Nucleic acid binder design. Structure first.
Lengths: 113, 114, 87
RNA sequence: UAUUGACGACCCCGAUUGG
């Protein structure tokens, strides 16, 4: 089944990615922004540069280059898990325990976590 | 503990001052009331840091292996973009800015009945 | 007298296109409409020096000798975009 | 009335100025 509301519609319009040159929020001004929907862009006020490692032997080769360690299961996120990703209010309140799934993306006064 | 949580993004209606939305300060000159310059920052790792170079990855039975990315002096090379995205997302949190990267999310999600 | 000279672009080579853009000094981004795409002859193309000179008196004019030295020095710029990369 | 079992990868550039 489908939850009755698409997640984008639970997010406040002021929190959505910026859509005009006037509504640029602080991070958008500091780091810069590009409109994903039309004209509009701004070069960030910040540059990171001159990265160096200070040490020399910084790489943990475990002992021989043919070794390689296997590493968990980095599964894809699955926001269908409403009791994890949905918020009971647009302030990000966690959902109540015990209710069915349907309670999830269910009211516009719901929010996202 | 579940290995992820969320910081709550508060709706920013009626946020004023500098935390609110504003026309940008711009690049054309250094403003008398605003600051510019160079900050020196030292990063040191606490848990090990993965920096896989996908350009050097290797495949067996479609299982994938990655070496650590290294720079022209043979030291581990840390992409400044990867520093940037770290800091930006932390900055977006503590400033509670607009969320800079939002994908489709425009169709209803599916679930199953019990 | 200055004849026309055809340019021999070198072997396996063809006209390049440079891109050009204007950067809005406020936003630091490409200014609306201020984009252009200049074609250029690639470096190292050759063409004949096509000069002829008629002297009504003996020798070679001293200033004309200076000009040829300036060409051997490569001090003379030609064509468009002389301030900004080319020529 | 709540049982039936265990598997599986994904994204591959996006938006804009073109005189």
């Amino acid at each position: 089944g489908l939850y009755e509301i698409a997640p984008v519609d639970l997010l406040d319009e002021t929190l959505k990615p910026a859509t005009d040159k006037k509504q640029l929020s602080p991070a958008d001004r500091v780091f810069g922004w590009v409109n994903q929907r039309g004209n509009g862009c701004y070069k960030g006020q910040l540059r990171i540069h001159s990265v160096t490692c200070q040490h020399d032997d910084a790489i943990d080769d475990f002992g021989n280059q043919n070794f390689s360690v296997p590493l968990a299961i980095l599964g894809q996120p699955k926001p269908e898990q409403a009791r994890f990703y949905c918020a009971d209010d647009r302030k990000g309140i966690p959902l109540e325990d015990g209710y069915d799934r349907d309670d999830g993306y269910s009211d516009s006064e719901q929010g996202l976590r | 503990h579940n290995p992820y949580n969320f910081v709550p993004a508060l709706p920013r209606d009626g946020i004023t001052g500098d935390l609110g939305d504003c026309a940008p300060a711009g690049h054309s000159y250094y403003h008398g009331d605003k600051y510019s310059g160079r900050i020196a920052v030292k990063l040191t790792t606490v848990t090990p840091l993965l920096i896989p170079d996908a350009s050097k990855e290797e495949i067996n039975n479609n299982h994938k292996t990655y070496p650590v990315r290294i720079g022209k002096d043979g030291k581990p090379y840390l992409p400044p973009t990867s520093i940037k995205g770290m800091l930006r997302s932390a900055y977006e949190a503590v400033t509670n800015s607009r969320l800079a990267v939002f994908e489709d999310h425009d169709s209803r999600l599916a679930y199953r009945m019990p | 007298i200055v004849d026309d000279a055809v340019i021999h672009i070198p072997n396996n080579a063809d006209v390049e296109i440079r891109e050009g853009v204007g950067i809005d000094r406020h936003f630091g981004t490409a200014a609306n409409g201020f984009k252009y795409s200049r074609a250029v002859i690639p470096k190292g193309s050759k063409f004949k020096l096509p000069l002829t000179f008629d002297s009504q008196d003996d020798g070679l004019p001293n200033a004309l000798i200076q000009l040829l030295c300036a060409l051997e020095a490569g001090d003379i710029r030609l064509g468009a975009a002389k301030t900004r990369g080319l020529g």
